[PDB]
Design an enzyme around this catalytic site. Structure first.
Site, PDB file in Angstrom:
ATOM      1  N   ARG A  20       9.507  21.366 -25.067  1.00 15.56           N
ATOM      2  CA  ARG A  20      10.630  20.699 -25.726  1.00 15.56           C
ATOM      3  C   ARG A  20      10.583  20.784 -27.245  1.00 15.56           C
ATOM      4  N   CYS A  41       1.249  12.509 -14.063  1.00 16.96           N
ATOM      5  CA  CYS A  41       1.612  11.188 -14.506  1.00 16.96           C
ATOM      6  C   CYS A  41       2.824  10.573 -13.773  1.00 16.96           C
ATOM      7  N   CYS A  46       0.307   7.712 -13.771  1.00 17.51           N
ATOM      8  CA  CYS A  46       0.737   6.625 -14.606  1.00 17.51           C
ATOM      9  C   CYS A  46       1.848   5.774 -14.019  1.00 17.51           C
ATOM     10  N   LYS A  49       1.401   4.186 -10.383  1.00 14.24           N
ATOM     11  CA  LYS A  49       0.311   3.203 -10.548  1.00 14.24           C
ATOM     12  C   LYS A  49       0.833   1.931 -11.205  1.00 14.24           C
ATOM     13  N   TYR A 180     -12.098   4.213 -14.539  1.00 14.73           N
ATOM     14  CA  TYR A 180     -10.865   3.444 -14.586  1.00 14.73           C
ATOM     15  C   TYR A 180      -9.994   3.562 -13.332  1.00 14.73           C
ATOM     16  N   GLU A 184      -8.840   0.443 -11.126  1.00 10.74           N
ATOM     17  CA  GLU A 184      -7.421   0.088 -10.954  1.00 10.74           C
ATOM     18  C   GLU A 184      -7.060   0.040  -9.476  1.00 10.74           C
ATOM     19  N   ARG A 207     -18.963   2.148 -17.350  1.00  9.22           N
ATOM     20  CA  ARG A 207     -20.175   2.242 -18.126  1.00  9.22           C
ATOM     21  C   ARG A 207     -20.049   2.937 -19.490  1.00  9.22           C
ATOM     22  N   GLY A 273     -13.966  11.477  -9.691  1.00  5.32           N
ATOM     23  CA  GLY A 273     -13.765  12.344 -10.859  1.00  5.32           C
ATOM     24  C   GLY A 273     -12.546  13.204 -10.658  1.00  5.32           C
ATOM     25  N   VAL A 353      -5.673   1.822 -22.320  1.00  8.05           N
ATOM     26  CA  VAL A 353      -5.476   0.558 -21.601  1.00  8.05           C
ATOM     27  C   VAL A 353      -5.865   0.857 -20.176  1.00  8.05           C
ATOM     28  N   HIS A 450       1.317 -17.980 -33.602  1.00  5.67           N
ATOM     29  CA  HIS A 450       0.826 -19.030 -32.740  1.00  5.67           C
ATOM     30  C   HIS A 450       1.943 -19.622 -31.920  1.00  5.67           C
ATOM     31  N   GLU A 455      -3.367 -13.670 -31.719  1.00  6.02           N
ATOM     32  CA  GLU A 455      -3.776 -14.296 -32.984  1.00  6.02           C
ATOM     33  C   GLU A 455      -5.325 -14.380 -33.138  1.00  6.02           C
TER      34      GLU A 455
HETATM   35  C1  LIG Z   1       9.560 -28.164 -31.142  1.00  7.15           C
HETATM   36  C2  LIG Z   1       8.745 -27.372 -32.132  1.00  7.15           C
HETATM   37  C3  LIG Z   1       8.170 -26.202 -31.764  1.00  7.15           C
HETATM   38  C4  LIG Z   1       7.429 -25.444 -32.675  1.00  7.15           C
HETATM   39  N1  LIG Z   1       6.850 -24.306 -32.206  1.00  7.15           N
HETATM   40  C5  LIG Z   1       6.088 -23.622 -33.059  1.00  7.15           C
HETATM   41  C6  LIG Z   1       5.425 -22.423 -32.604  1.00  7.15           C
HETATM   42  O1  LIG Z   1       5.459 -22.033 -31.455  1.00  7.15           O
HETATM   43  N2  LIG Z   1       4.697 -21.736 -33.528  1.00  7.15           N
HETATM   44  C7  LIG Z   1       4.599 -22.189 -34.868  1.00  7.15           C
HETATM   45  O2  LIG Z   1       3.956 -21.508 -35.601  1.00  7.15           O
HETATM   46  N3  LIG Z   1       5.192 -23.293 -35.291  1.00  7.15           N
HETATM   47  C8  LIG Z   1       5.941 -24.021 -34.442  1.00  7.15           C
HETATM   48  N4  LIG Z   1       6.535 -25.132 -34.873  1.00  7.15           N
HETATM   49  C9  LIG Z   1       6.415 -25.573 -36.278  1.00  7.15           C
HETATM   50  C10 LIG Z   1       5.022 -26.209 -36.549  1.00  7.15           C
HETATM   51  O3  LIG Z   1       4.872 -27.287 -35.634  1.00  7.15           O
HETATM   52  C11 LIG Z   1       5.051 -26.746 -37.972  1.00  7.15           C
HETATM   53  O4  LIG Z   1       5.315 -25.660 -38.848  1.00  7.15           O
HETATM   54  C12 LIG Z   1       3.672 -27.295 -38.338  1.00  7.15           C
HETATM   55  O5  LIG Z   1       3.327 -28.406 -37.472  1.00  7.15           O
HETATM   56  C13 LIG Z   1       3.721 -27.734 -39.807  1.00  7.15           C
HETATM   57  O6  LIG Z   1       2.295 -28.335 -40.224  1.00  7.15           O
HETATM   58  P1  LIG Z   1       2.182 -29.419 -41.291  1.00  7.15           P
HETATM   59  O7  LIG Z   1       0.653 -29.405 -41.607  1.00  7.15           O
HETATM   60  O8  LIG Z   1       3.002 -29.225 -42.393  1.00  7.15           O
HETATM   61  O9  LIG Z   1       2.625 -30.702 -40.724  1.00  7.15           O
HETATM   62  P2  LIG Z   1       2.452 -31.464 -39.342  1.00  7.15           P
HETATM   63  O10 LIG Z   1       1.781 -30.739 -38.421  1.00  7.15           O
HETATM   64  O11 LIG Z   1       3.707 -32.182 -38.995  1.00  7.15           O
HETATM   65  O12 LIG Z   1       1.594 -32.689 -39.629  1.00  7.15           O
HETATM   66  C14 LIG Z   1       1.957 -33.732 -40.587  1.00  7.15           C
HETATM   67  C15 LIG Z   1       1.044 -34.920 -40.209  1.00  7.15           C
HETATM   68  O13 LIG Z   1       1.106 -35.916 -41.288  1.00  7.15           O
HETATM   69  C16 LIG Z   1       1.088 -37.227 -40.625  1.00  7.15           C
HETATM   70  N5  LIG Z   1       1.655 -38.075 -41.663  1.00  7.15           N
HETATM   71  C17 LIG Z   1       2.896 -37.938 -42.224  1.00  7.15           C
HETATM   72  N6  LIG Z   1       3.097 -38.783 -43.230  1.00  7.15           N
HETATM   73  C18 LIG Z   1       1.919 -39.479 -43.354  1.00  7.15           C
HETATM   74  C19 LIG Z   1       1.524 -40.549 -44.265  1.00  7.15           C
HETATM   75  N7  LIG Z   1       2.287 -41.040 -45.210  1.00  7.15           N
HETATM   76  N8  LIG Z   1       0.260 -41.007 -44.069  1.00  7.15           N
HETATM   77  C20 LIG Z   1      -0.548 -40.524 -43.096  1.00  7.15           C
HETATM   78  N9  LIG Z   1      -0.277 -39.549 -42.227  1.00  7.15           N
HETATM   79  C21 LIG Z   1       0.978 -39.054 -42.393  1.00  7.15           C
HETATM   80  C22 LIG Z   1       1.964 -37.002 -39.434  1.00  7.15           C
HETATM   81  O14 LIG Z   1       1.771 -38.017 -38.495  1.00  7.15           O
HETATM   82  C23 LIG Z   1       1.372 -35.693 -38.921  1.00  7.15           C
HETATM   83  O15 LIG Z   1       0.364 -35.787 -37.969  1.00  7.15           O
HETATM   84  C24 LIG Z   1       7.274 -25.931 -33.985  1.00  7.15           C
HETATM   85  C25 LIG Z   1       7.840 -27.124 -34.379  1.00  7.15           C
HETATM   86  C26 LIG Z   1       8.575 -27.867 -33.464  1.00  7.15           C
HETATM   87  C27 LIG Z   1       9.194 -29.171 -33.900  1.00  7.15           C
HETATM   88  C1  LIG Z   2      -4.067   7.888 -10.538  1.00  7.03           C
HETATM   89  C2  LIG Z   2      -3.885   8.251 -11.991  1.00  7.03           C
HETATM   90  C3  LIG Z   2      -3.446   7.327 -12.877  1.00  7.03           C
HETATM   91  C4  LIG Z   2      -3.292   7.641 -14.230  1.00  7.03           C
HETATM   92  N1  LIG Z   2      -2.802   6.664 -15.040  1.00  7.03           N
HETATM   93  C5  LIG Z   2      -2.593   6.987 -16.317  1.00  7.03           C
HETATM   94  C6  LIG Z   2      -2.044   5.997 -17.212  1.00  7.03           C
HETATM   95  O1  LIG Z   2      -1.687   4.895 -16.854  1.00  7.03           O
HETATM   96  N2  LIG Z   2      -1.895   6.365 -18.515  1.00  7.03           N
HETATM   97  C7  LIG Z   2      -2.259   7.661 -18.957  1.00  7.03           C
HETATM   98  O2  LIG Z   2      -2.108   7.876 -20.117  1.00  7.03           O
HETATM   99  N3  LIG Z   2      -2.751   8.579 -18.143  1.00  7.03           N
HETATM  100  C8  LIG Z   2      -2.941   8.290 -16.841  1.00  7.03           C
HETATM  101  N4  LIG Z   2      -3.435   9.219 -16.025  1.00  7.03           N
HETATM  102  C9  LIG Z   2      -3.809  10.560 -16.520  1.00  7.03           C
HETATM  103  C10 LIG Z   2      -2.550  11.439 -16.763  1.00  7.03           C
HETATM  104  O3  LIG Z   2      -1.842  11.500 -15.532  1.00  7.03           O
HETATM  105  C11 LIG Z   2      -3.045  12.827 -17.139  1.00  7.03           C
HETATM  106  O4  LIG Z   2      -3.841  12.709 -18.309  1.00  7.03           O
HETATM  107  C12 LIG Z   2      -1.853  13.716 -17.491  1.00  7.03           C
HETATM  108  O5  LIG Z   2      -0.984  13.872 -16.341  1.00  7.03           O
HETATM  109  C13 LIG Z   2      -2.404  15.070 -17.956  1.00  7.03           C
HETATM  110  O6  LIG Z   2      -1.180  16.039 -18.317  1.00  7.03           O
HETATM  111  P1  LIG Z   2      -1.302  17.551 -18.154  1.00  7.03           P
HETATM  112  O7  LIG Z   2      -0.063  18.065 -18.953  1.00  7.03           O
HETATM  113  O8  LIG Z   2      -2.517  18.077 -18.571  1.00  7.03           O
HETATM  114  O9  LIG Z   2      -1.227  17.889 -16.724  1.00  7.03           O
HETATM  115  P2  LIG Z   2      -0.370  17.407 -15.477  1.00  7.03           P
HETATM  116  O10 LIG Z   2       0.463  16.385 -15.774  1.00  7.03           O
HETATM  117  O11 LIG Z   2      -1.218  17.382 -14.256  1.00  7.03           O
HETATM  118  O12 LIG Z   2       0.516  18.581 -15.082  1.00  7.03           O
HETATM  119  C14 LIG Z   2       0.004  19.894 -14.697  1.00  7.03           C
HETATM  120  C15 LIG Z   2       1.199  20.567 -13.985  1.00  7.03           C
HETATM  121  O13 LIG Z   2       0.900  21.997 -13.823  1.00  7.03           O
HETATM  122  C16 LIG Z   2       1.432  22.370 -12.506  1.00  7.03           C
HETATM  123  N5  LIG Z   2       0.668  23.577 -12.225  1.00  7.03           N
HETATM  124  C17 LIG Z   2      -0.695  23.663 -12.134  1.00  7.03           C
HETATM  125  N6  LIG Z   2      -1.119  24.913 -11.986  1.00  7.03           N
HETATM  126  C18 LIG Z   2       0.019  25.683 -12.018  1.00  7.03           C
HETATM  127  C19 LIG Z   2       0.210  27.125 -11.892  1.00  7.03           C
HETATM  128  N7  LIG Z   2      -0.760  27.993 -11.744  1.00  7.03           N
HETATM  129  N8  LIG Z   2       1.508  27.521 -11.957  1.00  7.03           N
HETATM  130  C20 LIG Z   2       2.531  26.646 -12.103  1.00  7.03           C
HETATM  131  N9  LIG Z   2       2.452  25.320 -12.231  1.00  7.03           N
HETATM  132  C21 LIG Z   2       1.167  24.880 -12.180  1.00  7.03           C
HETATM  133  C22 LIG Z   2       1.084  21.183 -11.665  1.00  7.03           C
HETATM  134  O14 LIG Z   2       1.827  21.195 -10.483  1.00  7.03           O
HETATM  135  C23 LIG Z   2       1.571  20.066 -12.581  1.00  7.03           C
HETATM  136  O15 LIG Z   2       2.875  19.621 -12.396  1.00  7.03           O
HETATM  137  C24 LIG Z   2      -3.588   8.948 -14.655  1.00  7.03           C
HETATM  138  C25 LIG Z   2      -4.026   9.909 -13.768  1.00  7.03           C
HETATM  139  C26 LIG Z   2      -4.175   9.584 -12.427  1.00  7.03           C
HETATM  140  C27 LIG Z   2      -4.656  10.637 -11.461  1.00  7.03           C
END
Ligand SMILES: Cc1cc2nc3c(=O)[nH]c(=O)nc-3n(C[C@H](O)[C@H](O)[C@H](O)COP(=O)(O)OP(=O)(O)OC[C@H]3O[C@@H](n4cnc5c(N)ncnc54)[C@H](O)[C@@H]3O)c2cc1C
Ligand SMILES: Cc1cc2nc3c(=O)[nH]c(=O)nc-3n(C[C@H](O)[C@H](O)[C@H](O)COP(=O)(O)OP(=O)(O)OC[C@H]3O[C@@H](n4cnc5c(N)ncnc54)[C@H](O)[C@@H]3O)c2cc1C
Lengths: 461, 461
Positions: A20, A41, A46, A49, A180, A184, A207, A273, A353, A450, A455
């Protein structure tokens, strides 16, 4: 003898991506494919599987239903339902890929390619000859199976390919391997209700991953109901009256070996193998170099030892992932057709992987690897282990482990390893940061999101 | 008059973070808290909201059960179950925070603080006086409610605080506001089964987000069964025989206004804004400057206009997020107790996640903001829209939208905006990359992780 600018053998991940991009650059290209487009593959890797993983994930999540305020969900998973839908989805992708090729004006030559005896590199498909000044071999690999000579009855077992053909959930399943794919498959079978065993040669799975991950992953499997049979291997397989009987040898170090029979096995899955698909290419007619497993040898630019013959992807045997095959095929097209001579893939810092439960993400060096590259005195790690907030209200629990490997005084981030809920989607952007050379201050200076699991990585101390 | 090195008024996100870091640095600190430690986030914010989101997420996921091969899950959500567990979890956190303070040797002064008439800044809590050369005001905010004078019967409605006190799922709920809190509450109530309406003054929610997100988010809400009442506002509220009756005015531009009564309302939830908690502090005895909403005014280092008096977090009215309060409180402690004079929080590039369904992640500039900073000719965006693979086999669908805002020839990444499954865990690492100054080549040169949603961001064209 039809001539093209670029001939690509194999229509899988790397072959299609390369073809290509070459065509965008004005190349007149053709893709040779003997089976289905999309290659491993899309058809048996691939994609199917991931669908099965999403299914297993539903199974787990359904265990927590009652804890979350809902009524207990009662039942039996129906394998054929999802199998049918999974197959249809794969069919949809096959059609899309084909259309992608057509819209790009890439010719699809259907059939099995082999090199010829001809001097200028030429291939034959179904009696007709094709040639190009640039020929990419991207034929991928296949699952490896044991020889009946070493393990009698091995052929009674299936591979990951056979897994995608199953039409019913096997009652009792034994998976052999600790990579592998093994991990798998075991996680999917187990979550969906098969009584599953994973048979490994040592004491831990994965290994080659960072040891925090191999340890954690082995534990998580046990915790999820997978029986991990350590220091064990199959000695023989036989077809009994009602399924299979697996003979195995367990040899814990410091102990005497013990032989055990595993009866009433429905599914024996070899995940030991992959082997490269080069055997029927007639490489030797051009003297193209391979290693002793059959892998094609290439340089940093994907060149083979023969001028105008390249290889990318699984057939090369390094970093067996779809995205690596894609990236390598794209960079190669830019080099060839855009004359960017420095165009090539950096094989460091490739992120992975593993779709276990929970999933694993890793990029960069393991702790040991950093230790060997920089020295113990120059390596510092940071890690955390916690129970994700998802589980605050559940009886079932999983853990999240994260480890950061830093090097030098600057604490350059050279490795990130984690396992946990959400880790499959979390890795990509940290892989970007790692690729850019971030240090730990860069992470630390990024305001956290987070509450999330992600992370934790920016708040390590 | 007890004297400390640092007195912190408010034991919420920013107050606790600042006090802890100061104490590590050797300061003798005291925290004044009139309610519960942990402040808004722990008690009535981030934490309880996330638990309720995880609950709503279960509800949705349960809609897809049958599509995944399982038997249809039948029922009724039980609000009190999860409410009880949620409250217990908050209790657990309160105890942890308290212990964190004690282990750090920070004194907790329980009660409401107010400044005194004394010359050197001094506060009074319960008759006793306390002073310090450095006093941090971190009293947060509160939900804003309408005055009965402007909207008669407004006091029949509750706020996000009241939402956390509810013990049963309201049958019919009307939420007023179009900010993140409104959006999140509506999404939780609706998913759990309340017949929900969201009443907004214009035609879209999240009007301060990138317009791709405000559009997409409004659509997703409709699609999830939330009735969005556009160009509408409440005129009056009254207690009927069976719940509330909301009188509203709808004024579509180009149309005549129309008044509608909304009957049988169980829950009217005002999510119109937050007000700073400064009113009872006696600020004026020190002449500390506030704006007209009551926010304390500070400079880039969190200084108020009075020497030795600082303010951080919600009370300042900017970037109302827990992690910003934390980061600002920490940087301030380093400045004061570590003598790092340049120590301050950069308010650019703060990432946010909105826990809608699917969740939203954003960091950096919206397309419009980049346009005003750099000029139309210097801004280029990339976007994609797709159905995540999770839905390949489901009848229910959600979309994933991603947009990248680049500036200058180099295509520096100045904004990332997305909505979709997994986006809550995906954002953190891209926020790191954005903070570091990545360009689009940096993203593009990072090998993808397949199959994931996250890989789309590194493969935009
Ligand atoms: C629903 C929801 C989902 C979220 N999901 C995510 C997520 O998935 N990922 C992400 O990264 N962020 C997420 N966030 C945002 C994240 O929670 C905030 O960015 C983070 O908690 C901010 O940290 P902070 O240290 O500023 O304050 P906070 O964590 O709020 O802490 C402030 C603390 O100060 C205390 N406090 C306040 N005033 C006083 C005071 N005068 N005296 C004593 N103690 C006091 C409070 O009680 C509290 O425990 C989410 C927020 C919400 C609301
Ligand atoms: C069970 C299994 C799982 C795998 N899983 C993964 C995976 O998840 N991720 C990954 O990256 N790799 C994986 N692999 C490996 C991957 O399949 C091989 O690395 C890849 O196919 C190698 O490409 P290739 O071009 O060398 O040969 P191939 O893809 O084998 O192709 C060779 C081709 O040449 C043709 N051929 C051969 N001799 C002749 C001839 N004389 N005249 C005309 N045509 C001919 C064959 O029919 C075939 O179609 C896996 C392999 C197996 C066996």
């Amino acid at each position: 003898v039809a001539s093209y600018d670029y001939l690509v053998i194999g229509g899988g991940s790397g072959g299609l991506a390369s073809a290509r991009r070459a065509a965008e650059l004005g190349a007149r290209a053709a893709v040779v494919e003997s089976h289905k487009l999309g290659g491993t593959c899309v058809n048996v890797g691939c994609v199917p599987k991931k669908v099965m993983w999403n299914t297993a994930v539903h199974s787990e999540f359904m265990h927590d239903h009652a804890d979350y305020g809902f009524p207990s969900c009662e039942g039996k998973f129906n394998w054929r339902v999802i199998k049918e839908k999974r197959d249809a989805y794969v069919s949809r992708l096959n059609a899309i890929y084909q259309n992608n090729l057509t819209k790009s004006h890439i010719e699809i030559i259907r059939g099995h390619a082999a090199f010829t005896s001809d001097p200028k590199p030429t291939i034959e498909v179904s009696g007709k000859k094709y040639t190009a000044p640039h020929i990419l071999i991207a034929t991928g690999g296949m699952p490896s199976t044991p020889h009946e000579s070493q393990i009698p009855g091995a052929s009674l077992g299936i591979t990951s390919d056979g897994f995608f053909q199953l039409e019913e959930l096997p009652g009792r399943s034994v998976i052999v391997g600790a990579g592998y794919i093994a991990v798998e498959m075991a996680g999917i079978l187990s979550a969906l209700g098969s009584k599953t065993s994973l048979m490994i040669r040592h004491d831990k799975v994965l290994r080659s991953f960072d040891s925090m991950i191999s340890t954690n992953c082995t534990e998580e499997l046990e915790n999820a109901g997978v029986e991990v049979l350590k220091f064990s291997q199959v000695k023989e397989v036989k077809k009994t009256l009602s399924g299979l009987e697996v003979s195995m040898v367990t040899a814990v170090p410091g102990r005497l070996p013990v032989m055990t029979m595993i009866p009433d096995v429905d599914c024996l899955l070899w995940a030991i193998g992959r082997v490269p698909n080069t055997k029927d290419l007639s490489l030797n007619k051009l003297g193209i170099q391979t290693d002793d497993k059959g892998h094609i040898i290439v340089d940093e630019f994907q060149n083979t030892n023969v001028k105008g013959i390249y290889a990318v992807g699984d057939v090369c045997g390094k970093a067996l992932l779809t995205p690596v095959a894609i990236a390598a095929g794209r960079k190669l097209a830019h080099r060839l057709f855009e004359y960017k001579e420095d165009s090539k893939l950096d094989y460091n810092n490739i992120p992975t992987v593993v779709f276990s439960h929970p999933p694993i993400g890793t990029v960069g060096l393991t702790e040991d690897e950093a230790i060997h590259k920089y020295g113990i005195e120059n390596v510092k790690t940071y890690s955390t282990s916690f129970t994700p907030m998802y589980h605050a209200v559940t009886k079932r629990k999983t853990k999240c482990v994260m480890k950061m490997v830093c090097a030098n005084k600057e604490e350059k981030v050279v490795g990130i390893h984690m396992q946990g809920l959400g880790c499959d989607e979390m890795l990509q952007g940290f892989a970007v940061a790692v690729k850019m050379g971030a240090t730990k201050a860069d992470f630390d200076n990024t305001v956290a999101i987070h509450p999330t699991s992600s992370e934790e990585l920016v708040t390590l101390r």
